[PDB]
Amino acid sequence: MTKVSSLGYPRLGENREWKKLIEAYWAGKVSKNDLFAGAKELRLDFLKKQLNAGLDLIPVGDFSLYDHILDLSVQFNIIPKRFAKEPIDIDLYFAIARGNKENVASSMKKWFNTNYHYIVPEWSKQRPKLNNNRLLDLYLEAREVVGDKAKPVITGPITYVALSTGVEDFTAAVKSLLPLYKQVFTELVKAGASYIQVDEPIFVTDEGKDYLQAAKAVYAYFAKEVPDAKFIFQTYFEGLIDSQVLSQLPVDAFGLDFVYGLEENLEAIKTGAFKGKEIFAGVIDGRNIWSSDFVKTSALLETIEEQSAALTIQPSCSLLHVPVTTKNETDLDPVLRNGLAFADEKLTEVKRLAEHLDGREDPAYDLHIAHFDALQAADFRNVKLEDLSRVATKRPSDFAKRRDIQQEKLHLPLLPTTTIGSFPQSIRRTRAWGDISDAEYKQFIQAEIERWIRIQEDLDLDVLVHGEFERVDMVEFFGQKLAGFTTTKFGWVQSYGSRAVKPPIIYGDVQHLEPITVEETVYAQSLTDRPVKGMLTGPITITNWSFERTDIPRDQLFNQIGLAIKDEIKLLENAGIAIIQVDEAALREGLPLRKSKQKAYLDDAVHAFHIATSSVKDETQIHTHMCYSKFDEIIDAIRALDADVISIETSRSHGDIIESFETAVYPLGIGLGVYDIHSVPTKEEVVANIERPLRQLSPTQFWVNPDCGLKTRQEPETIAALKVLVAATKEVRQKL
Ligand SMILES: [Zn+2]
Numbered sequence: 001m002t003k004v005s006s007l008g009y010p011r012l013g014e015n016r017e018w019k020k021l022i023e024a025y026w027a028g029k030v031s032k033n034d035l036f037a038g039a040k041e042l043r044l045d046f047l048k049k050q051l052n053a054g055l056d057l058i059p060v061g062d063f064s065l066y067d068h069i070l071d072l073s074v075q076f077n078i079i080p081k082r083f084a085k086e087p088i089d090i091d092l093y094f095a096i097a098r099g100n101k102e103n104v105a106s107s108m109k110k111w112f113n114t115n116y117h118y119i120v121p122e123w124s125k126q127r128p129k130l131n132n133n134r135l136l137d138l139y140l141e142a143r144e145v146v147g148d149k150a151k152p153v154i155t156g157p158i159t160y161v162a163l164s165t166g167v168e169d170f171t172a173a174v175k176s177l178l179p180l181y182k183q184v185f186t187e188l189v190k191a192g193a194s195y196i197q198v199d200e201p202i203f204v205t206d207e208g209k210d211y212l213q214a215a216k217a218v219y220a221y222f223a224k225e226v227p228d229a230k231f232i233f234q235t236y237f238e239g240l241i242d243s244q245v246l247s248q249l250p251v252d253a254f255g256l257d258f259v260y261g262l263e264e265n266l267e268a269i270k271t272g273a274f275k276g277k278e279i280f281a282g283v284i285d286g287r288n289i290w291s292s293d294f295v296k297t298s299a300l301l302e303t304i305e306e307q308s309a310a311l312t313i314q315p316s317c318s319l320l321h322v323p324v325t326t327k328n329e330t331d332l333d334p335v336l337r338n339g340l341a342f343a344d345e346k347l348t349e350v351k352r353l354a355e356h357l358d359g360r361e362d363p364a365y366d367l368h369i370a371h372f373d374a375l376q377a378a379d380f381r382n383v384k385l386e387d388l389s390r391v392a393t394k395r396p397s398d399f400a401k402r403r404d405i406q407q408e409k410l411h412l413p414l415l416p417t418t419t420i421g422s423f424p425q426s427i428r429r430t431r432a433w434g435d436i437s438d439a440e441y442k443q444f445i446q447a448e449i450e451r452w453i454r455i456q457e458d459l460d461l462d463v464l465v466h467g468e469f470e471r472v473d474m475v476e477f478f479g480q481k482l483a484g485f486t487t488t489k490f491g492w493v494q495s496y497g498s499r500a501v502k503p504p505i506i507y508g509d510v511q512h513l514e515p516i517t518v519e520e521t522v523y524a525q526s527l528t529d530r531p532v533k534g535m536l537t538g539p540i541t542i543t544n545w546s547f548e549r550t551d552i553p554r555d556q557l558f559n560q561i562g563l564a565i566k567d568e569i570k571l572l573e574n575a576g577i578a579i580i581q582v583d584e585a586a587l588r589e590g591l592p593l594r595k596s597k598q599k600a601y602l603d604d605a606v607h608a609f610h611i612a613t614s615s616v617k618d619e620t621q622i623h624t625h626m627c628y629s630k631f632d633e634i635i636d637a638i639r640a641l642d643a644d645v646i647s648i649e650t651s652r653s654h655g656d657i658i659e660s661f662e663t664a665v666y667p668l669g670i671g672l673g674v675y676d677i678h679s680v681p682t683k684e685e686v687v688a689n690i691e692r693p694l695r696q697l698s699p700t701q702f703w704v705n706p707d708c709g710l711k712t713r714q715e716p717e718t719i720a721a722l723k724v725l726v727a728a729t730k731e732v733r734q735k736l
């Protein structure tokens, strides 16, 4: 009676066969025939899983060999000018994604506030035309497996245009795509399509508010030209903006996110503005991995049902954003695993919620709730942590007074040189310990640390780092030793192209129990008489890169992690480490979509940082690394962190990134990333980068260092770049 659906499914496959397949093709190890056969096997496999879960409308079209936006580019003839000569085939497809020997790749940007990156369209004089029948082929293919349950999906024109680059005139660009979409949809209906999911997440965002009338024109058009289609104006990631206006779109159904846009959408329907329309209700978390709260969700569905003409139940976004399945996670505690749900498990949940709304009895439903309740009641979610009322949130002495005390203890030269902490890893082959004694691995890493310690000494870098050779992930390396964290055996998620990450799971209260990084850091320091830095990851990054608990508020979690970082920082200081660097490279990525919610997030972020760093002695020097760009946004927050030194990337802007610190008269220490760690710098090239920020703020305030970590670069080029860095700095010193 009540339909269930889904927006999308991962491409990976249970053991990353998709990743191995496309990567093998690029390496010339897999023919075209085996590429497409392999990709077909996967699709059919995925269609069956979704069929067997009981879905009434199974998403078809989101499967891709790299990216769903890129798919539209090639399909709509939006191909970068530099590739305009190539034949339009899969090699050109991958050429745009990865670049060939003559042309660089298209750029990629973040898919909203997710961990996924899409490939950015590059508009030019090119006339939009259909270059294939990609979506029709996929649809007809699916029909043979699932039949009338097949639901074509596609990113809408407005969102596609907004995510693009080079668009001179927005409505003209959008308008030129309409006839293509018309043909696409008309072919699908002819082939038997009914419901067609048309994604417009842009209408959950601030920017979206500029396009309300474009939405009216575009969908009035589709409704006039393809009258037989049942369109699903599909949004996700936040609430529907201007819901009272958009609710008037001439479309059959609306896809609302009741997980990340609960309150806004909830009040959008209580108005009775969707009583004449069908709601596709995003009620299962598509970006996280906890089993649903069935009581909560069922009661929610009842309210939605009475406020709509028809209800269809689905996850809040494409399952693209979660791992495939918990079935093979055999190392997990049963009380935890029975409280987890990845992609496949969510298909089952969505089915069971509908059957319970239709008043069908199923033992699985109450059993699900029982397993849900056990997890909540577990000891690990009831850990007694340090009392926050007995924990400092503000350092005893302010910046100015600390700057003196520290200078008296460190006597670092004007414009000290240093690095963001990490050095190139060669060996990964050694780590496979595979089986090798621990006293061998340690001795191995320690030999490598000494080596680089001498290197930095010769280069005359006055603040050293151990290299982090023992670290493969800046988050999981901590998650491995913090209680309340666990890793998975197979929880992979696509981040961009053939890259995937396997994020930790914060399943319980977070608690520091043992030294995490102290050993390596203390060793390095014993070798030299120059200051060695400790490197840690702040709570923001740790949360954003992990699958976080959803049963406790963001700020509470932040504080828990802050406490652990505090306890680890204590250990470091105890051991004699005098400079400690807290890295936050996810602050941007974790920023809420809506401008109206960013301040509360930043406040949570700043407080937790204070929890982490306010219990150090005045002499101990607190550094924070932030690989961001638009600092003007978070400037107040940054100044709020009260870091002795904050290092940025000024190389890309040639040094003009200081503008925000200039306006805000930043009185704290600033590290200058004067070399892109992604791309050999010239000596005259680096000095200019250094002197730029010297315009307003005083020189006694700056540090010279690379843009970010060096794990990306090769040792040869790394050493050469550092030589130039130190030379450029020394030079600007002589000129006083
Ligand atoms: Zn990423």
Ligand SMILES: [Zn+2]
Residues within 6 Å of the ligand: 298
């Ligand atoms: Zn009930």
Ligand SMILES: [Zn+2]
Residues within 6 Å of the ligand: 393, 606, 607, 610
């Ligand atoms: Zn505070």
